[PDB]
């Protein structure tokens, strides 16, 4: 299992590099600085914490060390605070694109930079409060024993309720906001295609510019991909917890399965900048410029 270490560190570094580049890009290219991209930066920094914090946290939890239950709940459940901060941003962004494309005229004055700060703040407030509830007294602990005397060993299915983990953080905090984003995009993709087909059946441009719609929509499709990947990285872990939780009777998920899902989830913080490079000219060009200068 020394390999589960090498891949985690390989992912640790990867995630910090790529995501700092996203933030370096936006700081740098003037065109990149906009509301839609603050939610992307909130998204990148929430992926930098993972490389800096939650992996060292997650590789350390693999030992099963000893520590005070209430300080211990902090080191297992910090990832919850991030994964959840991710989600409010993706959903923020989606709404943004939805408003921008579906209600183009009211947008400029509706969405503003300082209204964007409000969200990002509140979403960080509610990500800690939601992520750390097990600290709020939802602890499963006090009621391998060598540990004793104030120290109780730190494991996930012991101290952290599979109760709150299946119902509250999956059903309520993820499945719901995800099914919400699937809707909001599909609403854009399906609304946009009618607007595009209704410019066809009619002569002359206007009110909207056709070429400039399908250009907005290609970037929306590109922001939705990210959403889909999240589901693909964070779903199995829950699919697996379902099979483990709904049966605190039936058998438990094996070894080479679980760590594979923890990795697979932590993978979520790497691919993002990579999608931007492939799918978005403006980041790809800033990445390129940055890399061929500051790294040259």
């Amino acid at each position: 299992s020394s390999v589960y270490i090498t891949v985690e560190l390989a992912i640790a570094v990867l995630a910090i590099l790529g995501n700092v580049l996203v933030c370096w890009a936006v700081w740098l290219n003037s065109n990149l600085q906009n509301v839609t991209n603050y939610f992307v930066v909130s998204l990148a920094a929430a992926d930098i914490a993972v490389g800096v914090l939650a992996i060292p946290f997650a590789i350390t939890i693999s030992t099963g060390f000893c520590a005070a239950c209430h300080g211990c709940l902090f080191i297992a459940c910090f990832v919850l605070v991030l994964t959840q901060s991710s989600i409010f941003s993706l959903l923020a962004i989606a709404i943004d694109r939805y408003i921008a494309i579906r209600i183009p005229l009211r947008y400029n004055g509706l969405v503003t930079g300082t209204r964007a700060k409000g969200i990002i703040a509140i979403c960080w407030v509610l990500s800690f409060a939601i992520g750390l509830t097990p600290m709020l007294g939802w602890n499963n602990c006090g009621q391998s024993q060598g540990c004793g005397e104030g120290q109780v060993a730190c494991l996930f299915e012991d101290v952290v309720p599979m109760n709150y983990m299946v119902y509250f953080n999956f059903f309520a905090c993820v499945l719901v906001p995800l099914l919400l984003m699937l809707g909001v995009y599909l609403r854009i993709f399906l609304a946009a295609r009618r607007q595009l087909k209704q410019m066809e059946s009619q002569p002359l441009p206007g009110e909207r510019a056709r070429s400039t719609l399908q250009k907005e929509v290609h970037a929306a499709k590109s922001l939705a991909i990210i959403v889909g990947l999240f589901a693909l990285c964070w779903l199995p872990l829950h699919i697996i917890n379902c099979f483990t939780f709904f049966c605190p009777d039936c058998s438990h998920a094996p070894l080479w399965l679980m760590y594979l899902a923890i990795v697979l989830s932590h993978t979520n913080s790497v691919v993002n900048p990579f999608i931007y490079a492939y799918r978005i000219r403006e980041f790809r060009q800033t990445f390129r410029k940055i890399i061929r200068s500051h790294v040259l």
Partner: antibody, heavy 124, light 108 residues
Framework: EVQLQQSGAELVKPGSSVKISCKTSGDSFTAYNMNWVKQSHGKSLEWIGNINPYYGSTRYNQKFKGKATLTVDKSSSTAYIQLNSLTSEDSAVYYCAREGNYYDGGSVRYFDYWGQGTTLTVSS | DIVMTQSPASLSASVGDTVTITCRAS??????LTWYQQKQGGSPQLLVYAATNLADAVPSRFSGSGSGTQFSLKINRLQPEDFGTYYCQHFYGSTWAFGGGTKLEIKR
């Protein structure tokens, strides 16, 4: 249909002021930044500045700060440009252009629609 | 600030031959370069935006290309309607600036 309809030619004595108007019909006026450009001797183009029609907020090209001041009227849905302390060097054609915006991941901007131009001649 | 400069300042061409005009920004603007076509006594019209993208109902024969500091508009197989002077504009940054234009004239 979208038209930007500019006020007509102006003939002025140096040292005076002028308000050139741009009326926009055929869309929502408050959704887009209005910009003004100046064309001198039917060749070179300069960006004068622009204005957010919703809040009346303006950015100016530095060269034009203090000679040009931009203002709007939402009701009649028209944008203005006023020129002060006019001299011959200000004789040109001033256009209004409507800026346009979308997210490519970057903020894409262009001048969608332009007015017909209005001719300002300063002489003594 | 960011100085835009294009070439050539005048170009004369026969109908049907292909033409490229170039535009060079004094700083790195990525895309954020646009192109305008102005016919004599007319107001400029939008040609290419994002430096690669054609405007609604602009003939496919026009194409933009380039990025960073170097851009070019190329008209394939020129048409009589294409003669006129062409301008580029950068939207990079807060303050914006045009080209000198290039004047496309008929060879005879």
């Amino acid at each position: 249909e979208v038209q930007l309809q500019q006020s007509g030619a102006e003939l002025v004595k140096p040292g005076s002021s002028v308000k050139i108007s741009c009326k926009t019909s055929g869309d929502s006026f408050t959704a887009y930044n209005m910009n003004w450009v100046k064309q001198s001797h039917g060749k070179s183009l300069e960006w004068i500045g622009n204005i957010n029609p919703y809040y009346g907020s303006t950015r100016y090209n530095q060269k034009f700060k203090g000679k040009a001041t931009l203002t709007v009227d939402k009701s009649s849905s028209t944008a203005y440009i006023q020129l002060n302390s006019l001299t011959s060097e200000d004789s040109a054609v001033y256009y209004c252009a409507r800026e346009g915006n979308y997210y490519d991941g970057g903020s894409v901007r262009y001048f969608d629609y332009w007015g017909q131009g209005t001719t300002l001649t300063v002489s003594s | 600030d960011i100085v835009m400069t294009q070439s050539p300042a005048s170009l004369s061409a026969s109908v049907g031959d292909t033409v490229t005009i170039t535009c060079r920004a004094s700083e790195f603007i990525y895309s954020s370069l646009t192109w305008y076509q102005q016919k004599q006594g007319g107001s400029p019209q939008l040609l290419v935006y994002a430096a690669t993208n054609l405007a609604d109902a602009v003939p496919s024969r026009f194409s933009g290309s380039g990025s960073g500091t170097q851009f070019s508009l190329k008209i394939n197989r020129l048409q009589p309607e294409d003669f006129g002077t062409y301008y580029c504009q950068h939207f990079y940054g807060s303050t914006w600036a045009f080209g000198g234009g290039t004047k496309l004239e008929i060879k005879r």
